[PDB]
Design an enzyme around this catalytic site. Structure first.
Site, mmCIF file in Angstrom:
data_model
loop_
_atom_site.group_PDB
_atom_site.id
_atom_site.type_symbol
_atom_site.label_atom_id
_atom_site.label_comp_id
_atom_site.label_asym_id
_atom_site.label_seq_id
_atom_site.Cartn_x
_atom_site.Cartn_y
_atom_site.Cartn_z
ATOM 1 N N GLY A 118 0.781 -1.222 0.000
ATOM 2 C CA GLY A 118 0.000 0.000 0.000
ATOM 3 C C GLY A 118 0.814 1.273 0.000
ATOM 4 O O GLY A 118 0.227 2.359 -0.090
ATOM 5 N N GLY A 126 3.179 2.172 -2.286
ATOM 6 C CA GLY A 126 3.401 2.655 -3.627
ATOM 7 C C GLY A 126 4.742 2.315 -4.232
ATOM 8 O O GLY A 126 5.245 3.095 -5.049
ATOM 9 N N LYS A 127 5.324 1.195 -3.833
ATOM 10 C CA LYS A 127 6.643 0.781 -4.375
ATOM 11 C C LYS A 127 6.530 0.588 -5.891
ATOM 12 O O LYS A 127 7.473 0.980 -6.588
ATOM 13 C CB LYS A 127 7.109 -0.496 -3.675
ATOM 14 C CG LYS A 127 8.303 -1.187 -4.311
ATOM 15 C CD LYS A 127 9.256 -1.749 -3.286
ATOM 16 C CE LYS A 127 8.740 -2.999 -2.611
ATOM 17 N NZ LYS A 127 8.129 -3.928 -3.589
ATOM 18 N N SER A 128 5.430 0.031 -6.388
ATOM 19 C CA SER A 128 5.262 -0.187 -7.821
ATOM 20 C C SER A 128 5.205 1.136 -8.568
ATOM 21 O O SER A 128 5.918 1.329 -9.559
ATOM 22 C CB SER A 128 4.001 -1.008 -8.085
ATOM 23 O OG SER A 128 3.806 -1.206 -9.473
ATOM 24 N N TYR A 129 4.383 2.043 -8.075
ATOM 25 C CA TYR A 129 4.254 3.372 -8.721
ATOM 26 C C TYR A 129 5.573 4.133 -8.568
ATOM 27 O O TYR A 129 5.804 5.075 -9.339
ATOM 28 C CB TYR A 129 3.102 4.166 -8.102
ATOM 29 C CG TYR A 129 3.172 5.650 -8.354
ATOM 30 C CD1 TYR A 129 2.300 6.268 -9.233
ATOM 31 C CD2 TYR A 129 4.118 6.439 -7.724
ATOM 32 C CE1 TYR A 129 2.362 7.630 -9.475
ATOM 33 C CE2 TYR A 129 4.196 7.800 -7.957
ATOM 34 C CZ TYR A 129 3.313 8.399 -8.834
ATOM 35 O OH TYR A 129 3.379 9.741 -9.066
ATOM 36 N N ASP A 148 13.576 -5.926 -5.821
ATOM 37 C CA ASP A 148 12.240 -5.622 -5.254
ATOM 38 C C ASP A 148 12.012 -6.586 -4.091
ATOM 39 O O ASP A 148 11.508 -7.685 -4.350
ATOM 40 C CB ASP A 148 11.150 -5.784 -6.311
ATOM 41 C CG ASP A 148 10.965 -4.548 -7.173
ATOM 42 O OD1 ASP A 148 11.201 -3.437 -6.657
ATOM 43 O OD2 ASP A 148 10.587 -4.705 -8.352
ATOM 44 N N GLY A 154 7.816 -7.580 2.224
ATOM 45 C CA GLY A 154 7.671 -6.811 3.472
ATOM 46 C C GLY A 154 8.157 -7.591 4.673
ATOM 47 O O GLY A 154 8.234 -8.820 4.572
#
Ligand SMILES: Nc1ncnc2c1ncn2[C@@H]1O[C@H](COP(=O)(O)OP(=O)(O)O)[C@@H](O)[C@H]1O
Ligand SMILES: Nc1ncnc2c1ncn2[C@@H]1O[C@H](COP(=O)(O)OP(=O)(O)O)[C@@H](O)[C@H]1O
Ligand SMILES: [Mg+2]
Lengths: 367, 365
Positions: free
Chosen positions: B95, B97-100, B248, B251
Site C-alpha cells: 500500500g 506505492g513501491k510499484s508506482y 524488489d 515486506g
C-alpha cells in the site's frame, strides 16, 4: 485598580388591601434622596441616605417613580456596562408582599425590569448589528426551593412528582455553577418572552396571608452575551470576544409564621426561605465589614443562593440592590432591617474587569 | 569504498484515506521524516541522507518522478558507463506505492523506464562505429531461500517451479547455474519480459492484500562496452562489463498482527531472515566506508551471495524506502523507517505543537 461600588436603591410600595382594611398609618416619608421613618410612638426618628429612591406610594404625587423610571435609572447603566464588557447583577431584597417580583418581572400590563432589559438589549444590538460586531445570546432561568436547585425552562414530564433537582459545583476559575442547566439560545424578544412565561408558570407560588401569589422560591435570570469583534491582523479577522453575565435575582420574604398562617409545606418552605435570608444577610454584613479594613471570612457555602452568587455579591461584577419596603406602621422593624442591610450593602466594593478573553495568552504581554 | 545512499519516499493520501479523514502521522521539518504518534505518546525522528516529500504539491521540495530519478538512479547509469556495478533496492509494505515508485504508470513514469530509456539514449549517443554497446538481461526470484527463473514459461502440471543452485566462479564470483540471459535493444523488449515474469512471480492473499509479493525479485542488466585496438590487431580486446541490478524485496510481515497459517509462516520466516542479513550487510558496508575493518555476511543468504560483487568494492548501492503518512499504518511505517536508518533514531516528546496563543514566548520573553 478599579473598585466598583454597589448601587443601592430603595422602592416604597403603596398601601395594600390588608393595610387598608386595617387602617394602617403612613410612616415612611420622602423628600427626594433621603428616606425617613417617624415611629408612631414618637420617641426617635431614623433617616437614611441612598443613591436612588423610588416612591410609588401615590400615583398622583410628584416624584412618582414608574416601571420605566426605575428601569432607565438602574438597569440602563448596567446595560451600558454589559455592552462595555462587564458582568452585571441586579438583586431584590425585602419582606413578604413588598414589591420585589412586581419590580423585577412585573405583570402582563405592568412590566418589570427583565422584559425592558432584554428588549432594549436586543434593540441596541439590532441598531449596532454591523459586520464589525456579531452578537450571541444565551439565557438560563432557575429556581432555589428548600435548598434544592431546579430548572424553570423545561416542559416537565407527567408523573406523580416531576422536579428533577440539579447539583452545584465549583469550577476552579469560573467559580460556582450549576451542572445540568438548560442554556437556551435567543435571537430576539419573542423567544425571551416565551421562556419567561414558561418559567413564571413553572416557578413555585402559593397563597399565604400576606400575598396570595407569594413566591416560594428564589429566582435567577442569567444572560450570557458574547460579542465578537475584529481587528486587522496578520491573518483572518474575528479575533476578539467579550463575554458578559447578567444576573437578575428575585428573592422571597422573611415570612413570620404568626402573620403568615402556615403549617406543613408552607412552614417548611418558609423556614428554608428564613435560613436563606439569614445566610445572605450574614454575607452582606461581612462584605460591608471587609470593605472597612477589618479582615473577615464570608460564609457562602452555608446556602446554595450565596454559593452561586459568590461572583456577584463580591468578586467580579457591577452589582445593584433594590430594597423594597412598605409604608405601613405594622412592619416597622422589618422595614428597618431591610434599610439597615441596604445601608451596609452601600459600602460594598467589587473588582470589575473587562472579559477580553485574552489574559495570559498574547495581548496580556503586548500590554 | 562506498556507503549506501538510503532514501525514503512518503506517498500522498489516497481516495479512501482522504475520504475517511485518516489523519497525518508523518511530517517534515528538513530531516523530512518526523512521526508524531496520534495520541502524542512519542515523537520519533528519522534523519536520512535524501528524502522525497510527495505528500502535497504546494510544498517546496515536492519530489516528482523526474526528481527521484535524476537524484538517485541516474548516477547509477553514469557509473555503469564508467565500468562499475550498481544495485538499487526497493523496500515498502503493501500500500505504500513501491510499484508506482519504481515502474510508474502510463502517466508520471518511474525509475525503471527512465533508467532504460536514458541507457539506450546515451548508448546511441556514445556509439561511434568504433565503440559498441551490447545489452543482455535476466530476471529471477528468491523464494524460501531457493532460486527460480522468471523468464521461463511453464507447462501442464500442478506447478513447474524448478529450483536452480548458486555456484562461485573463482573470478566472476557467484552466479546461478542454468540462468537464461536474453539480448535486448529497446525498452519494449524489456517490458515484455517483465510483464511475463511478474505473472510467474510468487504471490498469495495473506492478512494484507491478495496481491502481496512473497519472494524477492532481481532484474539484472549486463552491459558490454567494447572498444577497438589502434596499436594493431584484433578489436574485442578492450572490453568493460557492467552489471546493474534492480531489486524488489518483500515486506517484513510481523506474525503477531497476521496469524500465519503453516505455508504463510514458512515464507515470512524466510523473508525476515533475508532482510536481517541484508541489513547486516548494509550496516557493515557503511561502517567499512567510514574507515573500519569488518566482515560482510554475504554467505548467510542466497540474495546477498548472488549480489556480492554488486555490494562491495568499486560498486554503488542505493535503497529507496516507500512509506504512507496515515495513522492507520504507523506500526508498518516505523518498521520500514527503522529498517532503513543507517544512523541512530531519535525518539522524544514535547507538546509545543500548540502554544496557547501564537507562540506565547515571542512576547512573554
Ligand atoms: N408599585 C405598585 N403599584 C401597584 N401595585 C403594586 C405595586 N407594588 C406592589 N404592588 C402589588 O403588591 C403585590 C406585590 O406582591 P409581590 O411583589 O409578588 O410580593 P414579593 O415582593 O414578596 O414577591 C402585587 O399583588 C402587586 O399588585
Ligand atoms: N508518490 C506518490 N505520489 C502520488 N501517488 C502515488 C504515490 N505513490 C503511490 N501513489 C498512488 O498510490 C498507488 C501506489 O500504490 P501501489 O504501488 O499499489 O503500492 P505497492 O506498490 O506497495 O503495492 C498508485 O495507484 C498511485 O497512483
Ligand atoms: Mg415574589
Amino acid at each position: 485598580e478599579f473598585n466598583s461600588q454597589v448601587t443601592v436603591a430603595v422602592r416604597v410600595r403603596p398601601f395594600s388591601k390588608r393595610e387598608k382594611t386595617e387602617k394602617a398609618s403612613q410612616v415612611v416619608f420622602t423628600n427626594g434622596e433621603e428616606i425617613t421613618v417617624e415611629h408612631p410612638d414618637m420617641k426617635q426618628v431614623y433617616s437614611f441616605i441612598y443613591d436612588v429612591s423610588f416612591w410609588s406610594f401615590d400615583e398622583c404625587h410628584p416624584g412618582y417613580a414608574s416601571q420605566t423610571t426605575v428601569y432607565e435609572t438602574l438597569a440602563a447603566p448596567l446595560l451600558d456596562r454589559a455592552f462595555e464588557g462587564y458582568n452585571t447583577c441586579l438583586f431584590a431584597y425585602g419582606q413578604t408582599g413588598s414589591g420585589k417580583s412586581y419590580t423585577m418581572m412585573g405583570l402582563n400590563e405592568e412590566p418589570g425590569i427583565i422584559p425592558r432589559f432584554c428588549e432594549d438589549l436586543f434593540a441596541q444590538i439590532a441598531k449596532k448589528q454591523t459586520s464589525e460586531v456579531s452578537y450571541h445570546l444565551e439565557m438560563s432561568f432557575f429556581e432555589v426551593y428548600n435548598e434544592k436547585i431546579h430548572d424553570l425552562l423545561v416542559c416537565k414530564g407527567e408523573n406523580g412528582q416531576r422536579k428533577q433537582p440539579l447539583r452545584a459545583r465549583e469550577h476552579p476559575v469560573s467559580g460556582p455553577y450549576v451542572e445540568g442547566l438548560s442554556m437556551n439560545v435567543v435571537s430576539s424578544y419573542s423567544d425571551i418572552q416565551s421562556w419567561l412565561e414558561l418559567g413564571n408558570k413553572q416557578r413555585a407560588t402559593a397563597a399565604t396571608g400576606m400575598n396570595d401569589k407569594s413566591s416560594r422560591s428564589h429566582s435567577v435570570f442569567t444572560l450570557v452575551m458574547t460579542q465578537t469583534k475584529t481587528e486587522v491582523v496578520e491573518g483572518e479577522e474575528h479575533d476578539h470576544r467579550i463575554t458578559s453575565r447578567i444576573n437578575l435575582v428575585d428573592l422571597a420574604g422573611s415570612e413570620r409564621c404568626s402573620t403568615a398562617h402556615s403549617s406543613g409545606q408552607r412552614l417548611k418552605e418558609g423556614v428554608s426561605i428564613n435560613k436563606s435570608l439569614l445566610t445572605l444577610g450574614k454575607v452582606i454584613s461581612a462584605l460591608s465589614e471587609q470593605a472597612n479594613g477589618k479582615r473577615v471570612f464570608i460564609p457562602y457555602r452555608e446556602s446554595t443562593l450565596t454559593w452561586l452568587l459568590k461572583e456577584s455579591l463580591g468578586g467580579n461584577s457591577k452589582t445593584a440592590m433594590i430594597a423594597t419596603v412598605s409604608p405601613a406602621a405594622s412592619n416597622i422593624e422589618e422595614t428597618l432591617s431591610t434599610l439597615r442591610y441596604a445601608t451596609q450593602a452601600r459600602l460594598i466594593v467589587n473588582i470589575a474587569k473587562v472579559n477580553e478573553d485574552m489574559n495570559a495568552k498574547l495581548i496580556r504581554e503586548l500590554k
